Design a protein around this motif. Sequence first.
Motif: not given
Ligand SMILES: Nc1ncnc2c1ncn2[C@@H]1O[C@H](COP(=O)(O)OP(=O)(O)O)[C@@H](O)[C@H]1O
Length: 341
Positions: A42-45, A60-62, A111-115, A173-176
């Motif tokens: 459950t991301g930012s928006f 992929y993780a979108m 985005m490219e998906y991570v296990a 690495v995360t978000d920017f």
């Molecule tokens: N490529 C990815 N694979 C798996 N989970 C992701 C991926 N990108 C984002 N997430 C999940 O979505 C959540 C929110 O993304 P984040 O990187 O914090 O950016 P933002 O805060 O801008 O949404 C994170 O807690 C993360 O677990």
Amino acid sequence: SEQESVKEFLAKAKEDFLKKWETPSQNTAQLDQFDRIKTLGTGSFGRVMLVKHKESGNHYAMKILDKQKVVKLKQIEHTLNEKRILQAVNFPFLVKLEFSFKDNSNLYMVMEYVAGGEMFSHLRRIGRFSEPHARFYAAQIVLTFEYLHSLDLIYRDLKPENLLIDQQGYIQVTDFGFAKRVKGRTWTLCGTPEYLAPEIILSKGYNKAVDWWALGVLIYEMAAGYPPFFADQPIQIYEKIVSGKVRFPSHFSSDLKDLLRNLLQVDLTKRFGNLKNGVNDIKNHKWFATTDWIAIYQRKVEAPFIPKFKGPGDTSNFDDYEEEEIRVSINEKCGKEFTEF
Ligand SMILES: Nc1ncnc2c1ncn2[C@@H]1O[C@H](COP(=O)(O)OP(=O)(O)O)[C@@H](O)[C@H]1O
Ligand SMILES: [Mg+2]
């Protein structure tokens, strides 16, 4: 002279970064090019559903994120910047933005998906890391910064929850959102209280140097369990940071202790990383003797932890049933604002 291959790589990196920076890629996909499986976060928006591109077969993780909800949250700039970076940046330890596109209802960031997952929750699993296993994760962060900083970028948001474990057990690495392209210096208070460098606290202009303070905090917290500056109220946290007396745990190495005192230096002119020798202070430190930097860069190192995979194929798909699909509105919403996206 083989150390001088690093300069040549960065130059080619930079000279190839600005290329994508000046003229950004756009709309490199239609939504009707993959079907959505499961809400992986459950991301930012908006919900972050899993996808499988029909052409390649690959998963992929979108990130989905409503147009309106950004403007209502006043973050039009943030998100536009965030893309323009990820679009143009490229490193082994950075989540790759594979495709980008808008429609009427929302923007999409494929985005490219991570296990595996965010390493905060992982750190909650295993109380604290041993120094060599912690070194593995930290050494990456160095190279990730050395890269970013080379482009005159500052990530400004280094914190565990942000960085995630690879399928192969490395870091991505995360978000920017907060990350900014700054030649000179900056003033925006944006970050998480425990990782904020004193400069930011005092509202004095902070520069690229901060990310090393952040690294310090991250290195500490990892090897010790708790963060170096932690309190019940943030006002109390700041004061502990600025009055930069740091108390170490017992098991802490004479090496490890030294580095931290250098990274967690309250005088920015004395802070490791931001010196005459630059990053090489860090890279040539005794605590980083064991590590072969180039091997880590080519991932040719045995990762201390590998999250039991089970593949990209979900054992629990969407974790049971879910909210079905998505809808794109007939009329255009906030098009003027995201012309750049
Ligand atoms: N490529 C990815 N694979 C798996 N989970 C992701 C991926 N990108 C984002 N997430 C999940 O979505 C959540 C929110 O993304 P984040 O990187 O914090 O950016 P933002 O805060 O801008 O949404 C994170 O807690 C993360 O677990
Ligand atoms: Mg985040």
